[PDB]
Design a protein around this nucleic acid. Structure first.
Ligand SMILES: [Cl-]
Ligand SMILES: [Mg+2]
Length: 667
DNA sequence: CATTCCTC
DNA sequence: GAGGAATGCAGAC
DNA sequence: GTCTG
């Protein structure tokens, strides 16, 4: 038998990996249960003809920020060079010789993001990619952005072709497998959207990703599977680049010449046919920012796009660019100028970095990683920042820049990848800008060698304490596996099924005017004459359940019922189509539930007060028993309908697959 | 995490 | 319009 | 009251 561990941000993320495996693997024997109170498992026996295999997947929901688990699995990434504070959605490990070894990192993205949102999470791919551990970025193509007021669809937005290409270039540079894989989203409707007329459906990688995962679990040669996935990532670059105006963006022939190794991104013969022209909003301008931008536009050549936040100053024009920068900011020191004038191409990245109050820009954290993925981390990068800094930030820059990098993820990104950091920033509470020219070359070189303490890691299945993650794991296990077809809902979408169709609402907002998005929505069809939709919220303590949370969960489902579902499909047939017919709330029984951990500190009066405060129809008080390890579940119904649900759960707390022996239902 | 704002 | 620039809320601490 | 999703 081989044992694997799925370390995820939550049980849903862990189960997504199992669903990928199970989509290709048709197992002969499947057994579910818990190895510990926090760790569910799935044990499978499957065969490849005559060859039988026995695997067990132990799931570890919720990553550390020794915070939750006794040791952090993410430490194995920082030991191999992942110096950014980047957490993927899932880490699959193999248990061998009493320790864990990372097989791959997986990140799930609900939509093909566009603009600076496309590279917002590029730090994850850059940092995990330079470790040698594969990084698989799985994105749904496509999901429409909605106007949350009326759920009407906004026009499709696509990332710059350089974003999907950065994964391929990072793969080439690092010798590691870093790829962007596209899964067919329910809203992929090419018959109705003209933007998708030239999309090649061979780019979809559902079968290929499952084949790759299974081959890695089997310790098989993945070279051929990797090449198929890389080719699909390259076809996305072709789809995107052939849909953009060639005048100020790279053509597919240019990307292809870089891909096949004919030229590097900085020695392209056609480099310069468009310049690097950074767009700065008027409201953002201060100090000598506008004149610096003019100096850049005087010597720059465009890198992939004329308006991306970065470009190249070729070594042939570097001396004149440096001379102009020194004349603008009154840099006279001969030692400083000598460092700036090194004979090599210079990549100039210009970022505001900070919002009006001095708070860091989330998308900017992936800007330098994107540059490093495209042109190599060893390339000389000149980072120019012009946004407002709080007095504490400028003080740390002049005292110990690494101390600032340690507290803030954006500063971490800047200090780790810039050879020169130039600030021309307003300081909050001060009348004028502060200028800094930081020769960060030695520091960057040291950071690119920094690795955390080498140590074998075996995450103990029992955490420091049980909290929201554990409540969520228990709620998901009971309602999704123990209690007996419908998908239900979560933060990614709500599905409602009948005898012919499945209706699905995508792009769920966190809140509506009167509602709050439930953690889980459970559909029960064989209890009442109408289907039941049970909306659940999970918290660590009963007092964490906010006032009227139960009423807000129902009002959220009522909000979705006010609109035609995003998509629908015939369960018997297939293929997702756009929503045609509206659903009616009277066709369903809606109930709300609040789940939490309670160690018998709640009296009859306390339960009565929780019901009065939250308005929940059902309260699920969960408590762990240590010897023997068991989850004691106490279901407290508020009314007669919820009591019928409690009886249904108690009667159906039986399973041929799930080991119900780990639970004790008091009532 | 995501939506609106602003420049070419 | 295209699409990068520029925002802020929220939850957890 | 800060950091990050
Ligand atoms: Cl194409
Ligand atoms: Mg992720």
């Amino acid at each position: 038998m081989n044992v694997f561990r799925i370390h995820g941000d939550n049980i849903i993320e862990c189960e997504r990996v199992i669903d990928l495996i199970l989509s290709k693997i048709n197992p002969q024997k499947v057994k579910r249960g818990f190895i510990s109170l926090s760790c569910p498992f799935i044990e499978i026996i499957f065969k490849e003809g005559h060859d039988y295999f026995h695997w067990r997947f132990d799931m570890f929901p919720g990553f550390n920020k020794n915070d939750r688990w006794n040791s952090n699995i993410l430490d194995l990434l920082s030991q191999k060079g992942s110096f950014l504070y980047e957490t993927p959605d899932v880490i699959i490990t193999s248990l061998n010789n009493g320790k864990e070894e990372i097989l791959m990192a997986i990140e799930f993205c609900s939509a093909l993001q566009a603009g600076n949102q496309a590279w917002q999470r590029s730090g994850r791919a850059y940092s995990v990619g330079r470790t040698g551990y594969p990084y698989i970025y799985i994105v749904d193509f496509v999901k429409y952005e909605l106007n949350n007021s009326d759920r009407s669809r906004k026009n499709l937005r696509f990332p710059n072709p350089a974003i999907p290409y950065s994964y391929i270039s990072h793969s080439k540079n690092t010798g590691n497998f870093i790829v962007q894989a596209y899964f067919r989203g329910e809203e992929y409707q090419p018959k109705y959207d003209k933007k998708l007329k030239f999309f090649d459906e061979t780019i979809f990688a559902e079968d290929d990703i499952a084949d790759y995962i299974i081959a890695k679990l089997q310790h098989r040669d993945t070279s051929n599977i990797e090449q198929l996935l890389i080719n699909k990532n390259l076809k996305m670059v072709e789809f995107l680049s052939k849909n953009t105006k060639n005048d100020n963006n790279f053509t597919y022939s240019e990307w292809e010449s870089i891909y096949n190794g004919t030229y590097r991104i900085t020695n392209l013969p056609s480099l310069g046919r468009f310049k690097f022209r950074k767009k700065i909003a008027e409201k953002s301008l201060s100090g000598k920012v506008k004149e610096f931008n003019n100096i850049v536009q005087r010597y720059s050549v465009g890198l992939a796009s004329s308006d991306l936040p970065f470009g190249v100053i070729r070594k042939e024009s570097r001396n004149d660019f440096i001379n102009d920068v020194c004349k603008l900011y009154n840099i006279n020191d001969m030692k400083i100028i000598k460092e700036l004038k090194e004979d090599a191409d210079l990549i100039v990245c210009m970022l505001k970095g900070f919002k009006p109050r001095g708070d860091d820009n989330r998308p900017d954290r992936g800007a330098l990683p994107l540059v490093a993925m495209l042109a190599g981390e060893n390339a000389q990068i000149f980072t120019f920042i012009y946004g407002p800094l709080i007095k504490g930030a400028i003080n740390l820059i002049d005292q110990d820049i690494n101390k600032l990098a340690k507290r803030n993820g954006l500063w971490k990104s800047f200090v780790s990848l810039s050879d020169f950091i130039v600030l021309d920033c307003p300081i909050i509470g001060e009348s004028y800008n502060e200028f800094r020219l930081i020769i960060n070359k030695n520091n960057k070189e040291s950071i690119l060698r920094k690795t955390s303490k080498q140590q074998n890691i075996l995450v103990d299945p029992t955490p420091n304490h049980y909290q929201e993650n554990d409540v969520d794991t228990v709620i998901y296990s009971i309602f999704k596996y123990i209690v007996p077809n419908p998908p239900g809902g979560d933060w990614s979408g709500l599905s409602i099924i009948d005898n012919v169709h499945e209706f699905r609402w995508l792009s769920l907002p966190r809140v509506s005017e009167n509602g709050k998005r439930p953690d889980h929505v459970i559909q029960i069809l064989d209890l009442f004459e109408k289907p039941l939709l049970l909306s659940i919220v999970s918290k660590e303590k009963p007092n964490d359940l906010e006032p009227k949370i139960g009423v807000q969960l129902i009002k959220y489902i009522e909000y979705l019922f006010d609109f035609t579902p995003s998509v629908q499909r015939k369960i018997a047939g297939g293929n997702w189509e756009f929503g045609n017919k509206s659903l009616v709330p009277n066709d369903f029984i809606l109930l709300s539930a609040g789940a939490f951990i309670d160690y018998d500190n709640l009296t009859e009066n306390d339960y009565e007060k929780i019901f009065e405060v939250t308005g929940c129809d059902l309260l699920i008080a969960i408590k762990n028993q240590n010897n023997p390890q068991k989850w004691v579940i106490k279901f407290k119904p508020k009314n007669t309908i919820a009591e019928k649900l409690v009886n249904y759960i108690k009667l159906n707390f039986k399973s041929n697959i799930f080991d119900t022996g780990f639970f004790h239902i008091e009532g």
